[PDB]
Amino acid sequence: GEFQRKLYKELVKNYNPDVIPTQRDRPVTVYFSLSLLQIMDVDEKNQVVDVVFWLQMSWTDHYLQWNVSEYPGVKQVSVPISSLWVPDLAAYNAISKPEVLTPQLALVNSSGHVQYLPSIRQRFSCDVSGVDTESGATCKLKFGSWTHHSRELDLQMQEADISGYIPYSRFELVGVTQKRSERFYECCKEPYPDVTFTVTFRKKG
Amino acid sequence: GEFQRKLYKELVKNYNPDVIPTQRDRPVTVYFSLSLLQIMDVDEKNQVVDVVFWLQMSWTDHYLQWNVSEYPGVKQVSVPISSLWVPDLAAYNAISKPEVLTPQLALVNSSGHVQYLPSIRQRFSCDVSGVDTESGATCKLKFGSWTHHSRELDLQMQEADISGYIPYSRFELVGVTQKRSERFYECCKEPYPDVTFTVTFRKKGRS
Amino acid sequence: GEFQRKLYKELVKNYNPDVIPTQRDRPVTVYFSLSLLQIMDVDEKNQVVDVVFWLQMSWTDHYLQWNVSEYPGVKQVSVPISSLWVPDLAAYNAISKPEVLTPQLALVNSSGHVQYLPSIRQRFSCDVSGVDTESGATCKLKFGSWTHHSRELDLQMQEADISGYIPYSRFELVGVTQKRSERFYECCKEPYPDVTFTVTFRKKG
Amino acid sequence: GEFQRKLYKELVKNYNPDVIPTQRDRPVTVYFSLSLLQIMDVDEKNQVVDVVFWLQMSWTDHYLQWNVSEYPGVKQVSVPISSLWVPDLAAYNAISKPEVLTPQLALVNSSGHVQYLPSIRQRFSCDVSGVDTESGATCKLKFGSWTHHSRELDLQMQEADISGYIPYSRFELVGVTQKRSERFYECCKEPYPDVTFTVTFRKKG
Amino acid sequence: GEFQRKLYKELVKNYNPDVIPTQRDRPVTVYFSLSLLQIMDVDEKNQVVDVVFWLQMSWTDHYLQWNVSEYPGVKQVSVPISSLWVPDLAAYNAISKPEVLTPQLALVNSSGHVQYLPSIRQRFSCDVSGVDTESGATCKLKFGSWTHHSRELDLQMQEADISGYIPYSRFELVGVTQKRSERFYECCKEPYPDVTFTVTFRKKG
Ligand SMILES: CN1[C@@H](CC(=O)c2ccccc2)CCC[C@H]1C[C@H](O)c1ccccc1
Numbered sequence A, C, D, E: 001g002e003f004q005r006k007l008y009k010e011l012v013k014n015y016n017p018d019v020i021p022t023q024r025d026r027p028v029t030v031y032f033s034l035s036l037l038q039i040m041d042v043d044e045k046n047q048v049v050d051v052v053f054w055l056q057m058s059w060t061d062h063y064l065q066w067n068v069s070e071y072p073g074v075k076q077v078s079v080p081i082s083s084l085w086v087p088d089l090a091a092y093n094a095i096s097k098p099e100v101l102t103p104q105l106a107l108v109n110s111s112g113h114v115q116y117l118p119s120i121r122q123r124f125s126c127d128v129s130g131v132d133t134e135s136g137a138t139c140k141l142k143f144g145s146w147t148h149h150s151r152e153l154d155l156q157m158q159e160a161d162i163s164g165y166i167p168y169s170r171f172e173l174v175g176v177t178q179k180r181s182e183r184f185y186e187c188c189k190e191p192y193p194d195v196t197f198t199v200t201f202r203k204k205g
Numbered sequence B: 001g002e003f004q005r006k007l008y009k010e011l012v013k014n015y016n017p018d019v020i021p022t023q024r025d026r027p028v029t030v031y032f033s034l035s036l037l038q039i040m041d042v043d044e045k046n047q048v049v050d051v052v053f054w055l056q057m058s059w060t061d062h063y064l065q066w067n068v069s070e071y072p073g074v075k076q077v078s079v080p081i082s083s084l085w086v087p088d089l090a091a092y093n094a095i096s097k098p099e100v101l102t103p104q105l106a107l108v109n110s111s112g113h114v115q116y117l118p119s120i121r122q123r124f125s126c127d128v129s130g131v132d133t134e135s136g137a138t139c140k141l142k143f144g145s146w147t148h149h150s151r152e153l154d155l156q157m158q159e160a161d162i163s164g165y166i167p168y169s170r171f172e173l174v175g176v177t178q179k180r181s182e183r184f185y186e187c188c189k190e191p192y193p194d195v196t197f198t199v200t201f202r203k204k205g206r207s
């Protein structure tokens, strides 16, 4: 679209994706949620889980807003994530780099709401010893900004989803939990939030 | 080519590959087809299919058209996909990133008709438990735009081809189905069209 | 050289590697030949060959020619392949991306005749069932331009031999064939030339 | 911040990441600590350890300092490591390239103090023969600047915490040591500082 | 370094890394040596060696020299290899791409002497059948410029070090040889020199 074209030239003009879009004394609040789609495998020897997650991440980038009157038809845009600031979310218990399965694009509202919803396959460190028991194995997968404290990036949880879980596969879900936390670290003087996704699973039969 | 050199400079001038080439209240209709070339392997433990396919994809980019009078000989061009807008097609049941086996180039017509025909090797999540049975295993491989709804990107099926299927290999094809749908998500108004490629296969030696 | 440095500045000035260097109603004729250096492995289950090839591709780019009088010493130069137009040759039966083992450089004449001679390791789909037989297994490895027809890119064979073949290794060569063909597709009024490298091999003893 | 863009624009237009930020006859002192998070696996045949480390690297880069008057709110910034000079630390006994698990960003103070804290998964050459013994296997993992001598880059150790060690897993820690040294090479006559991380571990039971 | 920053600006000014730094009809002499650090594994089926080498490559790039009077403190600089011309050395018997383990930097003197000393892990084609014998298996690993002949790049060998060989590991060294040769090819008027590293090893008792 010619109205869409005219906007991308502006949404680029003075945009630096390395800059966290904080506004005078206010953190960027980032909404976060993980959905376990499939437990691919477990390594009982090496103590690891091979898992496929759907991530729901949303925030506001004030540098990404536009007047819908200036660009009529343009309600939303699909922007490549490389073109924009994305939260520096770390998987604290990941033992492999993330494999992003879905197109690396984000949707952007006229008010600057960024929605990045990737499917990630990753391997995590976990005590899988009790996978063959009724109690099952429990993985506490922790995620959070690696470099931004609470006053810069406010991590918040959003409504989760266990409808996406693959019905076939050796593993059945005993329980799933998501909890947001905040702690002070001896290092920093400033606090840091995190979201912990907790899974309890077991081998079927 | 000489006019070809002059055209590539212009076909770049004001082109943004991140912009969907929709024209005033009309979606971009993308034609899509998938041809199963070979089922590489199955993981009965992990419930996965390793598959090779030929993707037939095409659309009209109204920003890519040119006057053949301005560029005589130039009927078509081989453009790298990275230089142009391509549909953001997601493999909904993929459990590995796609491995593109062919050159990453697209053929473009004087009227903006782009044809991207890659060979992809990818691993998908599938219930392969019945692979050793006469009924066989069935994989419902779903594909569609990740960010564009039906009124921005109109996914359409084109006539598919099962002549490309490798005659050797452990697996024989019981049946192949192609269906286009429009799914509504709780998230949003406006539906999301998808093409589901359904395969029924079985081990040749299952006796 | 101080002419070589100036030559590279000019050989870049108005050069687009995305443009096929066809000149007025004439296709670019590309000379091609494969030499099987080693059959690494066979997967009898998955029906695949892991092979190491030496490719000899050579063509003439008219935009790359220069006056030797303008650049005295400069007879030839080593240009990175990424800097120049290379034929879009596809391995039709490849089931893995090519692993290029040699430096990614091509040699270029004062008349613009380019020579690209890489060693590639690639995995191909092949009926390897008869590898343990006296008749042996036969692989018909097809190669050709993915996007250019006969009137744009004229694929031509160069006679290759089998002197490069590794003498050790489980596999002995029963026969090697190379044939150039021209195929028509329902799509296109103009045909697509290809070179098929055919191997017949068997496990030793 | 509005000044964050100002900051990133100038600390891009004038900063050369290739330049070691030494200031006149004074080396850059780099603080270094390694924390063993998990021993993933051991290869008794090939004599290798697959390990997950948390690295703590800090130094002062004088080219990255600013007064707060220059960038009002701006106290710190998350800069991509590719934008900065980072110590050229080599893992002398690594037999695989490092897999960096965390976002590749570093924190910079207004007084030029850089903090790079990556989680790395890497495979190292080690004599793992005694892993099944009470004495256990000992890995002497050596790290240091590959190209900078003592008078350019002053490697210094910091206090390492073994609090991060994964409680589950086949391997228990008998002992962990860190020693900084300065070696002489026949090449140079200026010494090369290094930190050797020594682990003694054994299979549980 | 204030002068260092001033030096990197000039060392960039008109530098093209694609250009071999030959001076008016004189070849660039490159010093080369290889040091076997460890034989990782052998594949008796596929006929391959997995090896870790330390490479010592040195050459003089006349475009890289500077007056030490113009830049006081600056005796040497660590430049990323990507920023400068490096010899296009091919591993003629490599069946995998090289895995470079060490930082990809080279040291450069005030007189243009470049020293690139990487640790490479690579897999080579080799007749490993006799690895379990007293005679042992012999690998003739050939290396040389892929595109430059004797009059452009003069390959020379330097001091061979076997002190770096890992004492643990299944394999003991029977013998190591390095020889430089000047091969003539039917293709070309000018000879192509090469260095062949020959190893004889065997499985320990
Ligand atoms: C990085 N770290 C905080 C800062 C910080 O620790 C730190 C900062 C500066 C100096 C020393 C330590 C910032 C937010 C994430 C948090 C992560 C957690 O600590 C951690 C460290 C090591 C492995 C796993 C997890």
Ligand SMILES: CN1[C@@H](CC(=O)c2ccccc2)CCC[C@H]1C[C@H](O)c1ccccc1
Pocket (backbone or CB within 6 Å): A054, A056, A115, A117, A119, A164, B092, B093, B145, B146, B147, B185, B187, B188, B192
């Ligand atoms: C991505 N999603 C739709 C939008 C949306 O979900 C959504 C949008 C905005 C907010 C929250 C959720 C767009 C069309 C595709 C669909 C995909 C499906 O989720 C999905 C998730 C995981 C595996 C397979 C498929």
Ligand SMILES: CN1[C@@H](CC(=O)c2ccccc2)CCC[C@H]1C[C@H](O)c1ccccc1
Pocket (backbone or CB within 6 Å): B054, B115, B117, B119, C092, C093, C145, C146, C147, C185, C187, C188, C192
């Ligand atoms: C890509 N295709 C031709 C063009 C074309 O078909 C086509 C063009 C335009 C529209 C529809 C179809 C050009 C020459 C190569 C050929 C490729 C071969 O089919 C093929 C595809 C997949 C695996 C093996 C072989």
Ligand SMILES: CN1[C@@H](CC(=O)c2ccccc2)CCC[C@H]1C[C@H](O)c1ccccc1
Pocket (backbone or CB within 6 Å): D092, D145, D146, D147, D185, D187, D188, D192, E037, E054, E115, E117, E119
């Ligand atoms: C690279 N070397 C020193 C430099 C140097 O030797 C050297 C420098 C210049 C010329 C010749 C040799 C500097 C600091 C690292 C040290 C490491 C060791 O060599 C080495 C090489 C390969 C594997 C393990 C260890």
Ligand SMILES: CN1[C@@H](CC(=O)c2ccccc2)CCC[C@H]1C[C@H](O)c1ccccc1
Pocket (backbone or CB within 6 Å): C054, C056, C115, C117, C119, E092, E093, E144, E145, E146, E147, E185, E187, E192
């Ligand atoms: C590449 N080749 C020479 C050039 C040349 O032969 C050649 C040149 C032009 C046309 C045909 C052949 C240059 C120096 C190295 C030599 C390498 C060897 O061929 C070779 C090829 C494949 C695997 C291992 C070795």
Ligand SMILES: O=C(NCCCO)c1cc(Br)c(Br)[nH]1
Pocket (backbone or CB within 6 Å): A053, A055, A089, A090, A091, A094, A097, A098, A120, A122, A143, D100, D101, D102, D103, D104
């Ligand atoms: O690994 C993750 N982030 C680190 C960056 C590595 O390039 C990550 C974040 C989330 Br949410 C997942 Br699941 N993985």
Ligand SMILES: O=C(NCCCO)c1cc(Br)c(Br)[nH]1
Pocket (backbone or CB within 6 Å): A100, A101, A102, A103, A104, B053, B055, B089, B090, B091, B094, B097, B098, B120, B122, B143
């Ligand atoms: O995986 C696919 N797209 C996502 C790319 C991001 O990693 C994909 C699309 C189609 Br059609 C296939 Br087959 N795979």
Ligand SMILES: O=C(NCCCO)c1cc(Br)c(Br)[nH]1
Pocket (backbone or CB within 6 Å): B100, B101, B102, B103, C053, C055, C088, C089, C090, C091, C094, C097, C098, C120, C122, C143
């Ligand atoms: O795979 C090949 N070419 C296309 C690009 C793949 O990503 C290829 C061509 C030849 Br000749 C060989 Br051998 N492989």
Ligand SMILES: O=C(NCCCO)c1cc(Br)c(Br)[nH]1
Pocket (backbone or CB within 6 Å): C100, C101, C102, C103, C104, E053, E055, E089, E090, E091, E094, E097, E098, E120, E122, E143
């Ligand atoms: O593989 C080598 N060079 C080719 C470049 C990558 O495609 C190589 C050179 C040396 Br010395 C070794 Br050891 N490997």
Ligand SMILES: O=C(NCCCO)c1cc(Br)c(Br)[nH]1
Pocket (backbone or CB within 6 Å): D053, D055, D089, D090, D091, D094, D097, D098, D120, D122, D143, E100, E101, E102, E103, E104
């Ligand atoms: O491998 C490491 N550095 C060099 C990479 C160049 O390719 C490395 C450094 C440290 Br500290 C660890 Br743990 N690994």
